[PDB]
Amino acid sequence: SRRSGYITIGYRGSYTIRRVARITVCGKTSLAKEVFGDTLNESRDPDRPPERYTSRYYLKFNFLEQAFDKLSESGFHMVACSSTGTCAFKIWTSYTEYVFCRE
Amino acid sequence: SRRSGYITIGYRGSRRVARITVCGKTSLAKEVFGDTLNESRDPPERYTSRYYLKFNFLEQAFDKLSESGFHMVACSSTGTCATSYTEYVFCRE
Amino acid sequence: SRRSGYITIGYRGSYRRVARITVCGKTSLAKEVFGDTLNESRDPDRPPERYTSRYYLKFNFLEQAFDKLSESGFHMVACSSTGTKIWTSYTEYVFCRE
Amino acid sequence: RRSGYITIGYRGSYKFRRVARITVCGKTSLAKEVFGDTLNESRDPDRPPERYTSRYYLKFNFLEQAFDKLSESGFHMVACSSTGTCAIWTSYTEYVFCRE
Amino acid sequence: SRRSGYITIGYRGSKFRRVARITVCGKTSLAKEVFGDTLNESRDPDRPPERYTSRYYLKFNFLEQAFDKLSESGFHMVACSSTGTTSYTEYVFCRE
């Protein structure tokens, strides 16, 4: 409870009438670092103080469930999930986010 | 974590978090967010759907709800191509 | 519990603008929860054990409906939304009292 | 009582909800336990108890009546999702139930 | 628990429901423990248990049969999302 809070995992996918390019991490930087350690890629947002938030971290691996398993090992649980679709000329893409919480 | 009710967190995206809206009992929202809350509407009603937050990190809003004993119980989003609107429902028992 | 059951709350939006909050479920549960804030005009004088999909509420704050459900011991167990210069949407929030 | 999942499907059309068919998917013995004679097996008849179906439906049209019967048999809603089909406007929503 | 983790079940969709292929994503040891011989590892074969995959799929067609097997191994459904224009729906399962 002293280090409670939220981490959101994001994933951009595409379907043609799973393939991963980048798993994004949003939340307080100290929490994301505790959970993911050196798998965290902070290049898009470097050198932030621990009590600041980020929406631009991402992970050095490409399996979604691999991110979820690490969150579970740190006592975070999935509490929500949403997805939004898009149509294009055929390919259709979507961004999915998975909200995790530690009590 | 004293008096029960719902607070809904919303934002419209294209992540770029333009503005985080707060809906619910006005007294509950002020308990949770204090001066991070700009009301921006002129007397106040018991319920609002037009409060919004000064900061732009969604998880920072979620974390403050957690500190007051609110839990996320649902979320939904809708989009049409030309953006999207996402909503997160919190509840304190 | 003997008075257990589901109530679904819905509303049509456009892009928050809430025109009307709909209420679906067994009528006696809806009446227990919302009392005089319930508008039964589109399905009046129903027996307490029959189901309706046509009640709505006389207020337009969604969280006020959620708060009343909580006061009667109902909890939100699911949520879904369907989308389409203005696009409309329907969102429903499923509540359950066990 | 044996564990399992039952999914409830609802073809909707769009303030009120469009009265339509409520479909039931899962192991047939579970669906029959839950719904009894409100279950319509005419599109998948004479199935053995341990086989699965995705073609049962209910003889009433109120979704919450189906949710209530699931609750009476100890099933709980664990997920839901809908698909928007723009063309009025029709959507399909499914509600996943689980008895552990 | 020692063998805790996530398995995500997917189906590409378009009496109504028609499901062709049920995809399985997660750690390969977990997918194998849950699904055994019903699992199709041909698309991603010769994989060590501690590695992850997004290319397994199931030999049967009933989504609830996949859900029931997950339950039998102590996995629970924690989230669900769908997107479409045809549709793709995924069900996230977790064993603590």
Curated annotation (Swiss-Prot), chain A:
Name of the protein in its database record: BTB/POZ domain-containing protein KCTD12
Organism source for this protein?
Homo sapiens
Where does the entry say this protein is expressed, by tissue?
Present in a variety of fetal organs, with highest expression levels in the cochlea and brain and, in stark contrast, is detected only at extremely low levels in adult organs, such as brain and lung.
Q: What's its job?
A: Auxiliary subunit of GABA-B receptors that determine the pharmacology and kinetics of the receptor response. Increases agonist potency and markedly alter the G-protein signaling of the receptors by accelerating onset and promoting desensitization.
Q: Where are the transmembrane segments?
A: none
Q: Where in the cell is it found?
A: Presynaptic cell membrane; Postsynaptic cell membrane
Quaternary structure note:
Interacts as a tetramer with GABBR1 and GABBR2.
Tell me which domain of life the UniProt entry assigns to the organism this sequence originates from: Eukaryota
Fragment boundaries within the full protein?
A: 204 to 325 of 325
From Swiss-Prot, chain E:
Per the UniProt entry, what is one GO biological process?
Answer: protein homooligomerization
Q: Keywords of this protein's UniProt record, alphabetized?
A: Acetylation, Cell membrane, Cell projection, Membrane, Phosphoprotein, Postsynaptic cell membrane, Synapse
Main location group: membrane
Specify the superkingdom: Eukaryota
Q: Which GO terms describe its cellular component?
A: cell projection; postsynaptic membrane; presynaptic membrane; receptor complex
The GO terms describing molecular function are:
identical protein binding; RNA binding
Tissue expression remark = Present in a variety of fetal organs, with highest expression levels in the cochlea and brain and, in stark contrast, is detected only at extremely low levels in adult organs, such as brain and lung.
Oligomeric form and interacting partners: Interacts as a tetramer with GABBR1 and GABBR2.
- Purpose: Auxiliary subunit of GABA-B receptors that determine the pharmacology and kinetics of the receptor response. Increases agonist potency and markedly alter the G-protein signaling of the receptors by accelerating onset and promoting desensitization.
Protein name, please? Answer: BTB/POZ domain-containing protein KCTD12
- Which species is this record about? Homo sapiens (Human)
- Lineage from the top down? Eukaryota, Metazoa, Chordata, Craniata, Vertebrata
Which gene is transcribed and translated to give this protein? KCTD12
